[PDB]
Write a structure and sequence with these properties.
This is Allatostatin-8. This protein is about 0% helix and about 0% strand. It is mostly loops.
């Protein structure tokens, strides 16, 4: 996913 950046917390 990576909503925030890459991790997608």
């Amino acid at each position: 996913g990576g909503s925030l950046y890459s991790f997608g917390l």
